[PDB]
Amino acid sequence: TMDKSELVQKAKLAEQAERYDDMAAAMKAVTEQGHELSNEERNLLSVAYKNVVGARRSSWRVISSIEQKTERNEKKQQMGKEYREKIEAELQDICNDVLELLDKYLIPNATQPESKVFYLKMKGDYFRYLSEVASGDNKQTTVSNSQQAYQEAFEISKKEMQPTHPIRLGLALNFSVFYYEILNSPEKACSLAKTAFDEAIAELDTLNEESYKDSTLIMQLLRDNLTLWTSE
């Protein structure tokens, strides 16, 4: 019914209106046409789902925080638990849909290494989001899948990208946050953030004239995390 041009415009309209569920549906339909996305289309798809999943991560944290602070009442605890599980169920569906797009279209159709790293990083991100709400066996599966996707992305970035590339730097940031928050490894988090920072400051001459401020901003986030994590 709707062609690619119509769905891309609909997504740009939905973004301005802050109607992210509409933005995500339009970009999901664009992806399912089976053709490789342009950088604009890829960014539209990423912003849409970041906001759709983001709202549930935020809500999950709020309801989790309330669950702990709430009084000893069997009925009240059960309401809170139920409500958290309703948010968890939504989060799982969102992450499963984007992981479906990544495995079926985005990763296999990626022809340039920039895009391959972007989508594998994205795969790591959404498995990390599944890990935050998962427990037991399932947690071990989503935690391994996250590390594996981040590592595959890291391997391609080190061989095919400049150490200042914003996609490579954003990956170093998210992967180091995975080690810190998901694996509870301040050592692995710092080792990764330090190496990425050092490698980038050694080759600032590789900064792209189109994205130099994207690079310096992420480099600041890396450095700030390193000084925060190496406190006292």
Binding site: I201, L204, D205
Partner: protein
């Protein structure tokens, strides 16, 4: 007229030292006075001129003439069609040592940068900078010792410190941007937002009153 008066002033004062630069840019955007002043500076006078500007000393006749020839050259030049990336190395600190990250400052002297990364970083050098701008004058066709392909920024050009960091060797590694570029410059449209970075970015009296 005014260009000829200054051009004559430069030949009277520097003789053959000024005249060797005559006609070195046949893509004649700049006057003879400007081409000779940019040459005299690039070739050797940068050291004495910038020292006097930076220290706030009164300029001698020769320095005065070179400084007005360079000022006139920047007036005619304006902003280039694209952002240019250039490099700069100094044995010690510079005027941006004081400037904190995200804030703007400037050098009192002219700012020589090079298109060649090699004739900049890193052995011996204490502060290494990557510069992004549009108002620089390419003097590589006038003076090009060591094929440095120099791009000069005007004296007192306001620069934003985008990043100031130190190496594990103790080398200050900086990223500067011409303040006049904007704050939306250097951003690839939507990439930071798309990168989904793992980092944090009526009133109250009812509520149940829906005040318009």
């Amino acid at each position: 007229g005014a260009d000829k008066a200054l051009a004559d002033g430069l030949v009277k004062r520097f003789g053959a030292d000024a005249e060797k630069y005559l006609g070195r840019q046949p893509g004649g955007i700049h006057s003879d006075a400007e081409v000779m002043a940019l040459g005299l500076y690039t070739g050797i006078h940068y050291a004495d001129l910038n020292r006097a500007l930076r220290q706030g000393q009164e300029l001698d006749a020769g320095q005065k003439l070179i400084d007005q020839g360079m000022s006139a050259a920047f007036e005619k030049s304006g902003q280039a069609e694209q952002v240019v990336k250039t490099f700069r190395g100094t044995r010690g600190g510079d005027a941006f040592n004081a400037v904190e990250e995200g804030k703007v400052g400037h050098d009192d002297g002219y700012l020589s940068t090079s298109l060649n990364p090699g004739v900049a970083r890193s052995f011996g050098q204490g502060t290494i900078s990557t510069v992004f701008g549009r108002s620089g004058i390419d003097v590589s066709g006038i003076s090009n010792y060591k094929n440095a392909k120099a791009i000069l920024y005007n004296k007192e050009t306001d620069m934003r410190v985008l990043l100031s960091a130190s190496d594990e060797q103790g080398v200050t590694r900086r990223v500067l941007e011409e303040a006049a570029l904007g704050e939306l410059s250097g951003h690839s449209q939507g990439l930071l937002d798309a990168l989904d970075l793992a980092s944090k970015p009526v009133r109250l009296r009812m509520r149940g009153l829906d005040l318009a």
